[PDB]
Amino acid sequence: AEMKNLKIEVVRYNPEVDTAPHSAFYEVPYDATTSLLDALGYIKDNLAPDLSYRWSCRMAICGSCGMMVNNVPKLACKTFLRDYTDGMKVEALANFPIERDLVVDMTHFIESLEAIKPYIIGNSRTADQGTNIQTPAQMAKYHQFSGCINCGLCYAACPQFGLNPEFIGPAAITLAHRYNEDSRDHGKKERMAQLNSQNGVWSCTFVGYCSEVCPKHVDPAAAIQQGKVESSKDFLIATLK
Amino acid sequence: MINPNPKRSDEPVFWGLFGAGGMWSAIIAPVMILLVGILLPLGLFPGDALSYERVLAFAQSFIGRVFLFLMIVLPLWCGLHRMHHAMHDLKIHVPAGKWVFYGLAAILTVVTLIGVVTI
Amino acid sequence: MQTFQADLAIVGAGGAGLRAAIAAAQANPNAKIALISKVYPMRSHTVAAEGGSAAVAQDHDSFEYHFHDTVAGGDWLCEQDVVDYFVHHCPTEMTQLELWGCPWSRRPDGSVNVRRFGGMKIERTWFAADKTGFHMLHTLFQTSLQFPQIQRFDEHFVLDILVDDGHVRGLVAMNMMEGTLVQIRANAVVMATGGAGRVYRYNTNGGIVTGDGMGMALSHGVPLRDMEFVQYHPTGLPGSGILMTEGCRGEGGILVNKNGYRYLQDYGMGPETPLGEPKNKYMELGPRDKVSQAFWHEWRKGNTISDVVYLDLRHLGEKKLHERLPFICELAKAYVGVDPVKEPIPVRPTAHYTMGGIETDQNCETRIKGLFAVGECSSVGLHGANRLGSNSLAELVVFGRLAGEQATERAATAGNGNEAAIEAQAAGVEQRLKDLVNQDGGENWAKIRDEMGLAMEEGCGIYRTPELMQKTIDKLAELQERFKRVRITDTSSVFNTDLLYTIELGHGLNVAECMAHSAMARKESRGAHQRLDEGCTERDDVNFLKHTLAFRDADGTTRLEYSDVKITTLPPA
Amino acid sequence: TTKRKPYVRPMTSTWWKKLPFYRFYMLREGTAVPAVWFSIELIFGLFALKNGPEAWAGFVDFLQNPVIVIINLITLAAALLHTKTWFELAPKAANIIVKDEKMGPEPIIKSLWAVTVVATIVILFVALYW
Ligand SMILES: *Cc1cc2c(cc1C)nc1c(=O)[nH]c(=O)nc-1n2C[C@H](O)[C@H](O)[C@H](O)COP(=O)(O)OP(=O)(O)OC[C@H]1O[C@@H](n2cnc3c(N)ncnc32)[C@H](O)[C@@H]1O
Ligand code: SF4
Numbered sequence A: 001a002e003m004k005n006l007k008i009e010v011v012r013y014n015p016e017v018d019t020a021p022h023s024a025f026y027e028v029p030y031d032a033t034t035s036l037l038d039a040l041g042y043i044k045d046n047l048a049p050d051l052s053y054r055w056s057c058r059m060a061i062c063g064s065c066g067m068m069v070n071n072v073p074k075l076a077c078k079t080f081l082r083d084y085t086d087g088m089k090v091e092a093l094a095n096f097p098i099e100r101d102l103v104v105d106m107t108h109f110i111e112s113l114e115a116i117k118p119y120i121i122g123n124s125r126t127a128d129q130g131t132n133i134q135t136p137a138q139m140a141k142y143h144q145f146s147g148c149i150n151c152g153l154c155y156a157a158c159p160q161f162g163l164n165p166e167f168i169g170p171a172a173i174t175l176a177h178r179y180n181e182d183s184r185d186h187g188k189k190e191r192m193a194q195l196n197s198q199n200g201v202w203s204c205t206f207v208g209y210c211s212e213v214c215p216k217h218v219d220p221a222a223a224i225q226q227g228k229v230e231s232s233k234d235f236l237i238a239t240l241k
Numbered sequence B: 001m002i003n004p005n006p007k008r009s010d011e012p013v014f015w016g017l018f019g020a021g022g023m024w025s026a027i028i029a030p031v032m033i034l035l036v037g038i039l040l041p042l043g044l045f046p047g048d049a050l051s052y053e054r055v056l057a058f059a060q061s062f063i064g065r066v067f068l069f070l071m072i073v074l075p076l077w078c079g080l081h082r083m084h085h086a087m088h089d090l091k092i093h094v095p096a097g098k099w100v101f102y103g104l105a106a107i108l109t110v111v112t113l114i115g116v117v118t119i
Numbered sequence C: 001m002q003t004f005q006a007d008l009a010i011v012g013a014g015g016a017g018l019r020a021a022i023a024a025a026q027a028n029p030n031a032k033i034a035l036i037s038k039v040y041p042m043r044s045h046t047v048a049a050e051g052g053s054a055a056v057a058q059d060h061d062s063f064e065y066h067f068h069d070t071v072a073g074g075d076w077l078c079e080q081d082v083v084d085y086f087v088h089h090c091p092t093e094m095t096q097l098e099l100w101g102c103p104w105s106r107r108p109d110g111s112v113n114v115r116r117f118g119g120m121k122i123e124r125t126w127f128a129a130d131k132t133g134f135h136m137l138h139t140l141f142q143t144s145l146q147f148p149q150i151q152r153f154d155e156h157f158v159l160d161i162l163v164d165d166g167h168v169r170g171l172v173a174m175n176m177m178e179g180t181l182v183q184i185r186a187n188a189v190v191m192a193t194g195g196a197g198r199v200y201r202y203n204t205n206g207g208i209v210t211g212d213g214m215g216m217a218l219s220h221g222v223p224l225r226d227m228e229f230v231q232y233h234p235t236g237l238p239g240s241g242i243l244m245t246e247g248c249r250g251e252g253g254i255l256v257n258k259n260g261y262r263y264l265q266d267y268g269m270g271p272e273t274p275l276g277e278p279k280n281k282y283m284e285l286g287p288r289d290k291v292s293q294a295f296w297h298e299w300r301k302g303n304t305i306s307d308v309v310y311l312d313l314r315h316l317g318e319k320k321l322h323e324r325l326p327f328i329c330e331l332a333k334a335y336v337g338v339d340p341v342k343e344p345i346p347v348r349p350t351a352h353y354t355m356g357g358i359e360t361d362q363n364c365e366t367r368i369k370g371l372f373a374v375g376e377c378s379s380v381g382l383h384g385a386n387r388l389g390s391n392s393l394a395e396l397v398v399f400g401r402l403a404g405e406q407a408t409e410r411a412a413t414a415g416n417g418n419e420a421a422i423e424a425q426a427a428g429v430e431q432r433l434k435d436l437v438n439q440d441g442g443e444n445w446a447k448i449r450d451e452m453g454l455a456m457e458e459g460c461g462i463y464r465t466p467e468l469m470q471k472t473i474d475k476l477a478e479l480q481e482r483f484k485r486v487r488i489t490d491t492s493s494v495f496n497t498d499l500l501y502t503i504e505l506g507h508g509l510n511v512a513e514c515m516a517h518s519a520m521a522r523k524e525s526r527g528a529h530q531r532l533d534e535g536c537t538e539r540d541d542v543n544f545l546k547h548t549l550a551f552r553d554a555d556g557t558t559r560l561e562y563s564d565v566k567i568t569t570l571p572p573a
Numbered sequence D: 001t002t003k004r005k006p007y008v009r010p011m012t013s014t015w016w017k018k019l020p021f022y023r024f025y026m027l028r029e030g031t032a033v034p035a036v037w038f039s040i041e042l043i044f045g046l047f048a049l050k051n052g053p054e055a056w057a058g059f060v061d062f063l064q065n066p067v068i069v070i071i072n073l074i075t076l077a078a079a080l081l082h083t084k085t086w087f088e089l090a091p092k093a094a095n096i097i098v099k100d101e102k103m104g105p106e107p108i109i110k111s112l113w114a115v116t117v118v119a120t121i122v123i124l125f126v127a128l129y130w
């Protein structure tokens, strides 16, 4: 047959040449299976070979994809042009420094996530002794908070993060929470120092956009909140003794 | 980049009151604005339910002084919390903003505590 | 070039690499290990694994039944001394993953459940719903954060390795953000860079699985073992190639043609089983290849739906679908528009896994002293002519650990090398990068990419013919000429993916020629490698029970050698 | 010297004006103004109640204004929105397992609305039927 075309607006930036973001427009063929990631590949194949963007897996599990689409944080490989016939506008993932085109400086993300210690601490059990015993009951305590693919859409959601780039973030808070609530760990006190910081849970105002854009339904807003409970118990504890 | 030994904050105190305050004004406020803000001045009540002698007969009882202090003070510590943070959100720099808002809350808290031990 | 010293470098932060980094940090607390990758470690292809991972667990299993299931599943091309070590260490590494917090799906009593894959009579695949790769790559990446020994070089694109007098000495990588090169000196290097499945037009893999680690080993005289065995996943979404786990059949799911016939009984995996109870080795849980081949035969008889077949799971139920196939549900819903509860899912075979990889002994060392290979990039000789589904992920951590331990010893007895020689190698990578940047010609790399995919798909497919193979050898050698006329029109330095993809393609051409030449030479039919022509339509243990080694000389001729299969207890028959 | 140019996008005090979800979030914290105004009001009526029926009659005269009846109607709007939204967000602060499954929030939002209905009925009944 004959494929339709969509005027896609993508936000370009080359730090060796521009003084700031420089917009563009590309005619992209499409049908009912074409993603934004399919479009970015096409543009780079036939329209602008110098166009850069992160990607890999193509099936919404890797998390490199992240970028704004009509000012919504979303994964390109799960965004489809069929829904943007009246306009589209890809911008590099919000609240992050832009390094080039659709790629952003994820440094603060990785340092945050590194700063809460996301790994089993204090369990002397050794592989010979067989596995730990943990029910689906103990597992349902944290299982939803474990599906995070470190994509970053919620940092672009969160207006607090935009106002306070020292805020450790929804993801990072959810992850430290995911280990607090695992019956196999014994290192909650090694994490509270970060979570009790002003840049901890207490920089979160329950705006709730984070969980709304999560492509894996982790509900970070639920983890943090539960962390303010906990942070508080710890406040209580410490203060009262 | 990111600190190693950050200062444990103090927000779990305010957040505690703002929590308590937010939950009181969610269950009780709706009926309180109905009664006091609408029925009372519209006389939409049977007989002398909301008449000066009855309201003073209630306010002066023990259960009334406790409820009138909670009705006033807990939503204060919840609203003024939210304002404090609305400020940051709106990028509005208020000097000693922690003192202004929370000091207003304690000011009014004392002022209402004075009131429920009666003038 | 800026230099940094390391006790060992590990290229690739997949499951394999990362386990290697851990072990290597855990074997030498004072080591300074350099783990490098062109993508942040949690973007590695590992994250897309949905089935499970294999290790003997139940009381009625035996290392011998896994041993056997792997040897036989591999058409006896397996180094039986390697497969022995493998199944004997799978239990300890799945357990060690659980000790690190991997959320393995559980039996009600707190024990780890197991389900059935790859045509293994006794079920022994551990899993975390159908997200198992995802839970396994993160458990490892997250657990690695605690070893200061591990220094990462996130989004460094490793260009080449430095070799001299038969020993490896470091590597040259580009800092992808800065566009600068960097020298990493270290006396063991552990390749862990994945398979080469993107050399196919339609594949199951992410955009980064372009083969770079194999192609580097080609350039230093290391030989890709067994590269003609490309396993095809039987159930991939049409067009996208997106993978639908087997765990759609280990849960009872069925494969039907355009007549609703469960055609797979008609091809030696009869009789048909009842909707209710799937039985291992039969029907939709058949031999991998057969389940793919049978698609081809159905397409001959005209029994495909216009061309797909159908994977029906409706008779699975909401609880079971959403508790053990959540991912599969949403994937169907978004890329083909199908509820696995209302409708059936259109699928067909898709290039998936590269059996072949860098040749390694039983220590994952290659012929070059100090250079090791582990993971999908390697061929430690575990899968022979056909990988047992759910054996791959176990490989990553069983041998990942080994590599990590073995690289750690090797670098601790290595002894120095010729500095002027080494730096002259480094200077040699740099020059070559410049020659590529200044190369011109007005050839479009992307168009070469697309043809190389169409050729591998046409000549190195499910069934193979000397005429089409020859045509793909011929197409690829034509493509090798055209690459030299590619012009890299982008000259920037900050995250220049125009340059990098061009580099990944030149690895693909090399690795793909190895596959093509290796298949054209193997005049038999074994495992994934099936030949329609006369005298090559069956296994030939007289003349070909031997590994295919492929080398590449500096004149760009792709030469083959052959080596013997270690047999221990299970003689072919 | 590197060849980078980490372009930082700036955030305006009007960030919430863009996306609707953001706006509903300002609105939901906006209910903070009518809630303290009502607590100011009650303090008035308190100290009017103490200064005798002369002052209390002044107070009821103010409540009738009726611009103050519109404001106190807006206040009854705001307090509902708060209740609606506060009830949705409370359950997330809990992590509860019921036979191997994280539950909520629907069973928690259901109970909170049941209590306020009962509190509203018992309060309307005590201040009016006597
Ligand atoms: C694709 C796939 C594979 C797969 C599967 C499902 C899909 C869609 N399901 C499986 C299953 O159910 N059971 C199983 O046993 N295996 C399954 N597989 C196969 C398996 O996942 C893979 O074969 C295996 O996971 C490979 O992992 P590995 O550790 O070997 O490495 P990788 O994850 O593929 O990542 C490669 C790393 O190398 C780095 N890299 C690549 N090129 C470079 C260069 N040039 N320079 C530096 N680093 C490089 C990557 O960045 C990454 O770190
Ligand atoms: S919670 Fe969701 S949005 Fe946030 S990082 Fe994790 S997967 Fe991404």
Ligand code: F3S
Residues within 6 Å of the ligand: A157, A158, A159, A160, A161, A169, A170, A203, A204, A205, A206, A207, A208, A209, A210, A211, A220, A221, A224
């Ligand atoms: S958007 Fe922000 S304020 Fe908290 S709930 Fe989410 S991190």
Ligand code: FES
Residues within 6 Å of the ligand: A055, A056, A057, A058, A059, A060, A061, A062, A063, A064, A065, A066, A075, A076, A077, A078
């Ligand atoms: S491709 Fe993996 S997240 Fe978009």
